[PDB]
Design a protein around this ligand. Structure first.
Ligand SMILES: [Zn+2]
Ligand SMILES: [Zn+2]
Ligand SMILES: [Zn+2]
Ligand SMILES: [Zn+2]
Length: 117
């Protein structure tokens, strides 16, 4: 929990970059990483600190709260939250093309959301 799974560093030292960098930790299993190690964009690096982020193994739909039907569980390209295609309104029959930003991110980030330009 107090070490980055990817570089084995900690909050005091990112071993890849040499800089101090906060860890983000999965709210369910404790899997931790530096945001840069997790290869998050600066927008996502920021977003995962504003809510109880979950790693891919633990990720649940933010709407229904389940981790079932992973073949329909979208990840927002800005905040990394999961959403089932069928939980969205309107429901999506097929996955989207290109980048996809959830409603929370569109509201908060506006023009900085991935879906734009
Ligand atoms: Zn790291
Ligand atoms: Zn986890
Ligand atoms: Zn759902
Ligand atoms: Zn989002």
């Amino acid at each position: 929990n107090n070490y980055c799974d990817f570089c084995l560093g900690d909050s005091k030292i990112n071993k890849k970059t040499g800089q101090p960098e906060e860890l983000v930790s999965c709210s369910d299993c404790g899997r931790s990483g530096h945001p840069s190690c997790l290869q998050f964009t600066p927008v996502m690096m920021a977003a995962v600190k504003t809510y109880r982020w979950q790693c891919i193994e633990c990720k649940c739909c933010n709407i229904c709260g389940t981790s079932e039907n992973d073949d329909q569980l979208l990840f927002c390209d800005d905040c990394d939250r999961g959403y089932h295609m069928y939980c969205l309104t309107p429901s999506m029959s097929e996955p989207p093309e290109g980048s996809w930003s959830c409603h929370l991110c569109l509201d908060l980030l506006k023009e900085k959301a991935s879906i734009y330009q």
